[PDB]
Design an enzyme around this catalytic site. Sequence first.
Site, short mmCIF file in Angstrom:
data_model
loop_
_atom_site.label_atom_id
_atom_site.label_comp_id
_atom_site.label_asym_id
_atom_site.label_seq_id
_atom_site.Cartn_x
_atom_site.Cartn_y
_atom_site.Cartn_z
CG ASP A 98 -2.03 0.95 1.31
OD1 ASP A 98 -2.70 1.15 2.36
OD2 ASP A 98 -2.34 1.56 0.22
CG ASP A 131 -3.53 4.70 -2.84
OD1 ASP A 131 -2.96 3.61 -2.53
OD2 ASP A 131 -4.49 5.12 -2.17
#
EC number: 3.4.23.4
Length: 323
Positions: free
Chosen positions: A34, A216
């Site tokens: 992440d 992201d």
Amino acid sequence: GEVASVPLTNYLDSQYFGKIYLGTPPQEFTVLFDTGSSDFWVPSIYCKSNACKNHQRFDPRKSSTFQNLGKPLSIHYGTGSMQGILGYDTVTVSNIVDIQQTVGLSTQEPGDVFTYAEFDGILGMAYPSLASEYSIPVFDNMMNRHLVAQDLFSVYMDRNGQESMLTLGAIDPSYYTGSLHWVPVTVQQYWQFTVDSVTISGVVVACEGGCQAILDTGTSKLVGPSSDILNIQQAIGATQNQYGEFDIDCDNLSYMPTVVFEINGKMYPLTPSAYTSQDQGFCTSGFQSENHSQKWILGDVFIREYYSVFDRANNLVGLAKAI
């Protein structure tokens, strides 16, 4: 230092997760790498929720290097909220050994979001400035102890959904075409940079006069201000669903516009097949609105097209055309 190769597996263009080992001897977990968060946590045997019951849980009682810290760790993922306790143990990521790694141990993961997710936990790769208190991000520890050959990581997201790969401490040119373009990060928290513009046929559709955007891997979609996304959905021929989604009739794919991103004076197009997700019967838009005047999120839709490089030594982003 060392180079680690961590092959990603995707759970339908949405979750890209791989393998890590925790404790001595090793307990194996699947984790979402992440770029939009900075903490590390996995489910623990003290977690009673249905979701913990459905995933790999860490048994500290089996680890010889486990050491409770006791500090609290609260997190948010999607509509989800997780609660855990910080400990220390040894992380194993491919080649690399990361010995007194801060690690969340869940206690509560209520609600379906977690139960149905395909990974066990999340391993955050954003700036330390985003980490919870008492938490040191995994990559920072590896950089501090010089475990990586270089203070950068590379993400290759296989559109074809087969060969995705996470590379720690190296760039591999066999993953992209052309040259690597380096964009400087404006704000060191998220991996943030400046988008010049979003054009459809040389006409500016969104991001009039520049905007802030974040790369992201944690996000599936391309997320932007609701007013701008609306322009995009109209213009690509997408209509609102009875679920609240934007459907696109598949096959209409040939007549759809190419949406172009101008980053640092270079062009980054998304074709209709790239921004379009087609599964089972439907075609859905990879475009998603955020209630109202912000920052764009360049999630998996974008990264599937562009091999992305994250450089902690120069605080730079590198983008190339994914092969």
